Design a protein around this ligand. Sequence first.
Ligand code: HEM
Ligand SMILES: Cc1cc(C(=O)c2c(C)oc3ccccc23)cc(C)c1O
Length: 464
Amino acid sequence: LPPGPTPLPVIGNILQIDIKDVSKSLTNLSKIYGPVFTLYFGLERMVVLHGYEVVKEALIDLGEEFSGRGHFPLAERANRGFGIVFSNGKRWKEIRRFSLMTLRNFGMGKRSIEDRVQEEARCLVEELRKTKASPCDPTFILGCAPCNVICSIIFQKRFDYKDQQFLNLMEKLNENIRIVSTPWIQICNNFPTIIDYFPGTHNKLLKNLAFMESDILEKVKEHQESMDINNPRDFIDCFLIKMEKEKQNQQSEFTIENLVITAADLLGAGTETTSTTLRYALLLLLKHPEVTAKVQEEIERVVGRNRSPCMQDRGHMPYTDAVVHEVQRYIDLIPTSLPHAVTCDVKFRNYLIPKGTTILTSLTSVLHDNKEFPNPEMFDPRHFLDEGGNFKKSNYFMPFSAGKRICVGEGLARMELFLFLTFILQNFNLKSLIDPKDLDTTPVVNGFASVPPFYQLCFIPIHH
Ligand code: HEM
Ligand SMILES: Cc1cc(C(=O)c2c(C)oc3ccccc23)cc(C)c1O
């Protein structure tokens, strides 16, 4: 077992963590026990992997052994094993696969995935105009887009921003995210005893998911009725079709129950994540007009006025792609990614990690490597640009994590970020209330995810 601070009887290693910034806490601890150390929280023992070296040697090289999902008392209470985000064994590789392929640009019908995002970007811009250039909070708008995107990929179509169903869904998605991100929820995951004495909070979430899932099930039924085995409209159809195919083995991991959960998983996995990054991206663009202006020039060069942007233009716009990467590397949305777990006994280094041991990877240590990224604390699009000005990749770019568990929506997220942002910059100018040299882009890490400080900006139309 890897070294680490001795844990007290009931509070474990809690006194070693500054809840106001768990991420940072782990980094400081690595400055003592190295890139690999053990920790104890509640009844959960965990091994922290800090530093690119150990992170790659685990997620990549030893991919299969670290392909397991960390123990989640909360997730296992709400999903019970179903879904993608928290499934395992056969069940995981099963749903995962189908999801990966069904999500391919043309993995679910004649209509491509990009066509949906494109349309949403059209609405996103259409709504921004409504603000009439007046000071406003992009928090809401930037949230409807990513959410509506998933909706159009799961259901036959999207929803009007006014539609109540939509509002109920997003409002319910926010409450659920707040809950799970609270320090209290973190405590229950580790110590499942206290949750029985104070079920209140967990019940609210379970209730929200229950209602959310029911509404899904219903639509899943509306599909079954008008399904076209040879003309899939969305995820549901594909899944439903897949069922008909494996209607011969009683071991088919594909069931209506797994669909509902999976649908819910994706829905909650692509909203907050993408939404927060977009809102953070704009904030950074206000702080750095110099950078915003350049992107606009590249959009002006490679795209022009007569045409809206598309994914084919990304490979042509090296600078714009750099900013998108820098924004992700800088904000470090998920400091510690999602809890992992060794599928068996692994002799990582001199230390041996027992089967089923929770593994916490510090993506922060990778995305903020002072070496691969000089001055990782500063926002600079240069980090992903060579001397010539061409885009340069990096094995240190793991916002979506890495390994057999890498984000299922990595291609979808990047597609949205690029299109959404470029659409906005091509139609509007970014002017903030107070001076761009004043407002601070510093995060407010909630522990589970980083959140940008509150701010307001104005969307000034570019007519030409
Ligand atoms: C900019 C936004 C996003 C970021 C930064 C992000 C990041 C990540 C990360 C770090 C993980 C955990 C990987 C691990 O367990 O090692 C993950 C999981 C996942 N994400 Fe995303 N993600 C984003 C958007 C999306 C979107 C748009 C979708 C929906 C299609 C989505 C779907 C998922 C799913 C299904 C998983 C669980 C995968 C598995 O365990 O097999 N994500 N994401
Ligand atoms: C709590 C929870 C998180 C995620 C998920 O994909 C997220 C990940 C990996 O990071 C996030 C940051 C903000 C909001 C959601 C996520 C996915 C599910 C199914 C959950 O129950």
